[PDB]
Each structure stands twice: as C-alpha cells, then as structure tokens.
Amino acid sequence: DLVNFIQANFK
Amino acid sequence: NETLAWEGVMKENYLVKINTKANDNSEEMRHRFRQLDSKLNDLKSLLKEIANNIK
Amino acid sequence: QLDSKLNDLKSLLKEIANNIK
Amino acid sequence: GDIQFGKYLRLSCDTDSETLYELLTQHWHLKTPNLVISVTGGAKNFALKPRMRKIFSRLIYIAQSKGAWILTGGTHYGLMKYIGEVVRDNTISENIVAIGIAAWGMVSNRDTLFSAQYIMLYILDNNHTHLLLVDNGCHGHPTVEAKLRNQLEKYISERTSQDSNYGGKIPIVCFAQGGGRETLKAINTSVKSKIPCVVVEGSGQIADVIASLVTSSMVKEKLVRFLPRTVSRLPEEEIESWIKWLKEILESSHLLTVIKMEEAGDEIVSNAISYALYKAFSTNEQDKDNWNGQLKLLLEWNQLDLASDEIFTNDRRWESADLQEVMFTALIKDRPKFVRLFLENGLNLQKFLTNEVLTELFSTHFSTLVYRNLQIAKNSYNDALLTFVWKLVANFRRTRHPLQALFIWAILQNKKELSKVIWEQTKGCTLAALGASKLLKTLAKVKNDINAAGESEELANEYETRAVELFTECYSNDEDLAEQLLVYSCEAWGGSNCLELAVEATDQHFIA
Amino acid sequence: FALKPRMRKIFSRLIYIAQSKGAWILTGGTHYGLMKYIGEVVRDNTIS
Amino acid sequence: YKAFSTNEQDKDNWNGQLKLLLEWNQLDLASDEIFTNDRRWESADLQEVMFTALIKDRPKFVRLFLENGLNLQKFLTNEVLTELFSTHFSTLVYRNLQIAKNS
C-alpha cells in the first residue's frame, strides 16, 4: 500500500 | 524547638567528622604532586617565551 | 623539597633572560 | 529492495532533502533528539585497539540512552562492521537507529525490486537497520555519496528542533576517529557550517596531526612525519590543496574539540560532547546573554562543576526564584548533586516546598507500581505509621511539615543519595532515621524479588548505623540534653518518640 | 553571593577564634547574603 | 630487526619481517611496525603466521591475530585441524589418554 505512493513520491 | 536546634548543631559537627574521616586518607599528596608538576611545566614555557621575545 | 628547589632554580633562567636583554 | 534477515532504497542525487526527511520522520522513525555522525576512512583495512573498542562501546551506550541517530558509511568494511556488531549486541540485551549511506556503483550485486532479497565489491553491512544507495550513475566512479550526505546534515541542523534545551535546536555533533583522505574533506565541509566536531587524539593519524597542531612549513612537516606513505605516494600538486583545508580546520578552534590522551575516565566521551555543545551554544552569540537556557543545557548532562563555574560565576546576579525551575527539573531528573548545589548556593527550600508543588509532585510523578505496592503492604501489615503515611499520600494525591513528606517520597522510591541529601535538612534528624529503618525493614522480607531485599536491607542498616552514631555523639556531648531528646516526641511525626520506634523495630543495638 | 565549602569552614573557624579570644565583630549587617550567614553562625554558637 | 629492515633488498615485504619478529617474543614492536595504521592487512595473510604461532606456543600473538581481523571460523578448516591433530599431537599424551580411557 505505502510502497506504491513512496515509489511515486521519489520516482 | 530548642532541642531540635541543638540536635541540628550536633548533626553539623557529626557531618564534619565523617567527611574528615574520609578526608584523612592522606592521598592529597599525589594530587599536590600533580599540581606541582603542572606548575613546573607551565613555568617551563616562560624560558621559551623569553627566548622568543629576545630574538 | 626537591620540587620547590626545582621551581626556585626555574626562575634563574627568567632572571638571566631579563638581564641579557 | 527491502530485505529482512529495514527498507533499503536507491536514491538519485537530485532527491530533495526535505521530502526524504519528511518520509523518514512521518513514516518510520520518531523525532530525533540528537545526531551522532562518525566519519572514517572508506578503506576496508583497519586496526582495532582496546581503547577504541571501549570508547565506541560507551558512545553507543550514550546514544541509546539519549536516543540519537547514527550515520555511517555502512560498507561492511572494517570499523563500520564492528559498529554494527555492537548495535546488534545491544539489541540482544526503545531501539537503536543506525543509518548507512553508500553508492550503487560500489555495490557488487544488484537485485531488482513482494520483497527482493539476497544473502551473502564492497559488500554492504549486515547489521545496519536502514540503508540507502546513491544511483546517480558512474558505476565505476566511487566517492559520489559524500555531497548528498552533507546536504542531509545541514537541513537537519538549521530546522527547528521543537524540543527542550539547545534553544529549540539539535546537537548534530560530528565525530572523527581514524585517518583517511576523505576525512579531511568531510571535516572541512562539516565545519563550514555551525557543526562542531570532536576528534579522538588516538590511533587516527590525521586526528593526531590535527590534535598536535592545536605555519605552512610546520603543517607540511607534521603531515609528512605522520603519514610518510600517503604523502610520498600523493603528488606534490595536491598537497598544497590539502594545506588550505588544514588552515581552515585550524583557523576556527572554538568549534573544534579534542579528547585528551591521558584521560582514562569512563565519562570522557560525554564530557567532550557536552563541552563541545556548550562551546557552540555559548559562541552562537544569538542567545549568549541568557543563563537559564545554558544552565538547563548543562543540567541535561551531568557536568556539575563546569555548570557551577560557568553559570554561577562570582559576583553574578543569582536571582531569588531563578533556580526554582532548574531545581524542580533536577528533582524530576534525579540529579542529587545539582539539588545540593542549588540548596547550598542560595536556594530557600522552605519557601519552595509550597502546597501546589508538593501536590503536583505527589499526584503524577509518584510511581503507580510503588503506589500499588504500598497499598498492598498497608493492607497486609497496617502498622501504626503505615496508616499515617498512606493517609498523607492519599491527601496530597487528591504544622504541615512538608520536609518529612518530601523525605518519605524520596525514600519510598529507593533513592540513596537524594534521600541522604534531604535527611541532612530535616529538623527531627534522629527520629527520621529510625522511622526510615523501620519502614525499610517492613519490606525487607518481601521474598518476591531477591535483589531488592538485599538492597533494602543494606539501606536500612546504613540508616540504623547513622542514627546510632549520631545519638552516641550527642550523648557524649551532653547527657541531660540527650535524655530530654529521648523523652521528647516530635510534632506528630508518627505519634511516637525514638525509643518506641527502636523497640518496635527490634533494634537491639540501639537499645544496647 | 555564592557560598563555598572552604569559605564556610574558614568563617566558622574565624568565629570560633573570635569567641575564644572575645573579639568584636563589625560587619555591614544588611541581612544580604554572606552577612546573614555570619549571623546564623553566631546564633549557632550561642546555642552550644 | 633494524639490520633486516635497513637491508633494503627485501624491506618492502612484511611477511618475512613479521615471521622474524614472531620468532622472538616482541609482540608490541611487531604490532606497531608490521600492522601500522591504514595498512593493507590482507584477508589470508595472517593464516601462516598464526598457524606458526599456534605451533610455536605464542598465545599473545594468537590473540593479536584474532583481534586484528582474523576470522577463526573460516580458518579452522577440516584439513588444518586434521594436520594439527595427526602430527603435532603428543605421542606421550596419546598413550596417557588411551590408558586413562581404558581405566
């Protein structure tokens, strides 16, 4: 769940 | 009231006595040795300072 | 006593330096 | 890739420091009260020494006690590996934080992002909880992470701490142990900002050089003597550059601190860190005039002598109520020596021990476990004074003699030095000692825990001996006054005099 | 004012010597800091 | 040691110098000189020296090797243990152990 938003956050 | 004050006075003397019981170790000689060594070391730099100033 | 003697002798160097200048 | 045997991520140099800090704080980690950063040569080869091992173990212990963050290379090479081991050891015996920073190019093995894990140049550390990798590029190009690391520290230092002490800021102390080519660059970039560093004057060759320095020809001679191999291998052109760095490092000495070689005390590391932080805070000059914040900062650490000599000084305005807050904290903070200093430096204890402060102290800071233990003990035995003390505590939780209340509170929590300090101020000196001995002996036979029974028995015996010696000296001074004191009964201390308490507690020696 | 252990001992011994000899003591007597302590000491010696 | 080091024919190497200093019980000098600081200690370089120390009965050198970076678990291989137990084991001790076990 959090991993997707984290990955999108850093890119 | 008065008796409690007298007790406090004797308590002060007792505390002094116990602290002196600890202090009577006579180990202050080593600390005085260290202080004298430090004083001699500090005085040593005076000769170097004088030599630098003279030149 | 030896420490005091050494301390006293130390001032000899300062006195000599002052006299020379 | 996140591997469990903490999250491990690869980051580009363009990553914003603010976003990274926001992630680290909001998501996983808690607020940081201090940051200890260790810089050592990236070379794997290293030599351990007994003193270095002890120093780093004590540093880890201090960091755990305070709860500081630890930043290191985390390349599983030499010293860093040992550090990780120590962390794991402390994890065996709320948790320590150790972040390692490295570069993607150095990593021998790469696994794409479920959870992808691998078990096994420059293999990464295994004990570090959190790790990050730099993925800028140049797989064969090393020494890329350094820049980012610095950007991480400064942003933290400048940001408001929103915490007590240090003027709402964070320590961020920089540390140096060992000699390396990048050590000088790291130290220079750290000192460029208001980041104090302390350098160990031990094995570290460059550390030894810097310590010895505190002219260009002299600096060059010292550098050549200390590191003949590196200087001989390095070209003459680069040497000049190095000199510049040294100058800056030596130009500003108020931030720089060095540990003495002769010192062998356990608290040397804490002393050095506290002194460095005190120097930085005092020389900030933004809030150097004030003395309350500086006093609190020095109180957080147990530097009593330095705090006295600096804050109190001589012929300085000590104020009448200024010490109220500091001594209140010391009583909460369990700093007996600071309490004694405050009492003997001008503080009036009778005025301070107001009803409100005592109510606040007894209402919240009183241990719940101690409260339950006292309740069960009163239910079991319920002696003459157990009801009195329990009623007093209950009244305060909801001819006052507050000093006795404070003394009882100190005793009930098994504090030796603080209890003795409070005892040195009571009026009914002897009766208080006998009462405390009886109270401790009541619980001495709990049998639930073996260790606490021994400690309680020792404390009771010490108090009994103190009372016996005091009365012996008092009688040897005056006979009739001693007898009068014996017959005398305090102002409802417990409704009984010394003789009754002594006989009740089967004190054969006192009666003999 | 700031008290120190050595100052306390020194002034206590001074008071003892004055009592033994019977000397007069003159001070500011403004109940401010050190002077107050001196008075306390006197009272203590008056008790014993 | 001064003569060997100043020979300059084989001053670069450190294995022979370490062995020479190991023959005599100069542990502190050997440490300070050979190991130095920020010097390549090698992963398997200490194998032969510590093997000899175990044969040579030099406990302090063994401790130094262990605490300076040596990995004991990796070294204690089957072959080295077999060699140590096969030959260096005292025959008199072997007979004494056999008779004790029989008794």
Query: Could you give the CA distance from residue D322 to residue D89 in angstroms, rounded to a whole number?
Result: 44
Query: Could you give the CA distance from residue C6 to residue D459 in angstroms, rounded to a whole number?
Result: 50
Neighbour tally for F64: CB within 10 Å? 20
Length of chain E: 48
> How distant is the Cα of C12 from the closest Cα of chain B, in angstroms?
10
Q: Of F34, F38, F36, give the one whose Cα is nearest residue F46.
A: F34
Q: How far apart, in Å, are the Cα atoms of F92 and each of B28, B49, D286, F89, F101? A: 59, 73, 81, 9, 14
Query: SS3 of F95, please?
Result: helix
DSSP secondary structure string for all residues of C3-20: HHHHHHHHHHHHHHHHHH
What is chain F's alpha carbon radius of gyration, rounded to the nearest angstrom?
17
Query: SS3 of E13, please?
Result: helix
DSSP secondary structure string for all residues of D469-499: HHHHHHHHH-HHHHHHHHH---SSSSS--HH
- Read off the DSSP letter of residue D123: P
Contacts of D511 (CB under 8 A, 6+ apart): D502, D503
Q: Please indicate if any CB of chain B lies within 8 Å of the CB of C18.
A: yes
Residue with tokens 């073996």: D450
Nearest to D481 among B3, B13, B14 (CB): B3
Phi (first) and psi of residue D102, to 5 degrees: -145, -175
Contacts of D412 (CB under 8 A, 6+ apart): D370, D374
Q: How far apart, in Å, are the Cα atoms of D351 and each of D2, D185, D343, D354, F61? A: 60, 56, 12, 7, 66
End-to-end CA distance of chain B: 74
Q: How was this structure determined?
A: cryo-EM
Length of chain A: 11
Q: Tell me the chain D residues in contact with residue F39 when contact means C-beta distances shorter than 8 Å.
A: 45, 47, 229
Q: Are strands D69-72 and D174-176 parallel, antiparallel or unpaired?
A: unpaired
- Tell me the helices (H) and strands (E) count for chain B, helix number first: 2, 0
Nearest to F67 among D45, D48, D229 (CB): D48
- Read off the DSSP letter of residue D36: E
Nearest to D429 among B8, B13, B17 (CB): B8
Query: Could you give the CA distance from residue D347 to residue E48 in angstroms, rounded to a whole number?
Result: 26
Q: What is the 3-state secondary structure (H, E, C) of chain F?
A: CHHHHHCCCCCCCCHHHHHHHHHCCCHHHHHHHHHCCCCCCCCCCHHHHHHHHHHHCCHHHHHHHHHCCCCHHHHCCHHHHHHHHHHHCCHHHHHHHHHHHHC
Q: Of F68, F66, F58, F71, give the one whose Cα is nearest residue F27.
A: F58
> How distant is the Cα of D251 from the closest Cα of chain B, in angstroms?
22
Q: Of F43, F41, F47, give the one whose Cα is nearest residue F80.
A: F47
Sign of CA dihedral F35, F38, F41, F43: positive
Q: How far apart, in Å, are the Cα atoms of D487 and each of D423, D484, E21? A: 22, 5, 37
Resolution of this PDB entry, in A? 3.3
- Does chain D touch chain C (at least 3 C-beta pairs within 8 Å)? no
Interchain CB distance below 8 Å, C17 and B43:
no
End-to-end CA distance of chain A: 16
Query: Could you give the CA distance from residue D41 to residue D50 in angstroms, rounded to a whole number?
Result: 19
Contacts of E46 (CB under 8 A, 6+ apart): none
Q: Tell me the chain B residues in contact with residue D473 when contact means C-beta distances shorter than 8 Å.
A: 10, 13-14, 17
Structural element, H or E, at residue D186 = helix D181-192
> How distant is the Cα of D123 from the closest Cα of chain F, in angstroms?
15
Query: Could you give the CA distance from residue D75 to residue D103 in angstroms, rounded to a whole number?
Result: 9
The token pair that represents F61 in the structure block:
């050198």
Interchain CB distance below 8 Å, E1 and D346:
yes
Amino acid at D285: E
Cβ burial, residue D286 (10 Å; 0-12/13-18/19+): exposed
Interchain CB distance below 8 Å, E1 and D312:
no
Angle at D480 between CA D476 and CA D481, to 5 degrees: 80
Interchain CB distance below 8 Å, B5 and E48:
no
Neighbour tally for D347: CB within 10 Å? 19
The answer to whether residues D145 and D154 touch, using CB atoms and an 8 Å cutoff, is no
Query: SS3 of D165, please?
Result: coil
β-strand partners of D100: D72, D131
Q: Are strands D35-39 and D130-134 parallel, antiparallel or unpaired?
A: unpaired
Query: Could you give the CA distance from residue B41 to residue D139 in angstroms, rounded to a whole number?
Result: 56
Angle between helices D205-213 and D236-251 (to 10 degrees): 50
Sign of CA dihedral B48, B49, B50, B55: positive
Phi (first) and psi of residue D392, to 5 degrees: -65, -45
Residue with tokens 């007979």: F95
Query: Could you give the CA distance from residue D214 to residue D211 in angstroms, rounded to a whole number?
Result: 5
Amino acid at F8: E
Put the strands of the sheet holding D69-72 in their side by side order: D8-11, D130-134, D97-103, D69-72, D35-39, D174-176, D197-200, D257-259
Chains that touch F (3 or more CB pairs under 8 A): D
The answer to whether residues D410 and D416 touch, using CB atoms and an 8 Å cutoff, is no
Write the Ramachandran bin of D7: left for phi over 0, alpha for psi from -120 to 50, otherwise beta: beta
Q: Please indicate if any CB of chain D lies within 8 Å of the CB of A9.
A: yes
Interchain CB distance below 8 Å, D41 and F39:
no
> How distant is the Cα of C8 from the closest Cα of chain B, in angstroms?
10
What is chain B's alpha carbon radius of gyration, rounded to the nearest angstrom?
23
Neighbour tally for D62: CB within 10 Å? 17
Query: Could you give the CA distance from residue D427 to residue D403 in angstroms, rounded to a whole number?
Result: 9
Q: Tell me the chain C residues in contact with residue B53 when contact means C-beta distances shorter than 8 Å.
A: 21
Query: Could you give the CA distance from residue D474 to residue D469 in angstroms, rounded to a whole number?
Result: 9
Q: How far apart, in Å, are the Cα atoms of D387 and each of D379, D391, D438, D439? A: 9, 6, 14, 12
> How distant is the Cα of E21 from the closest Cα of chain D, in angstroms?
23
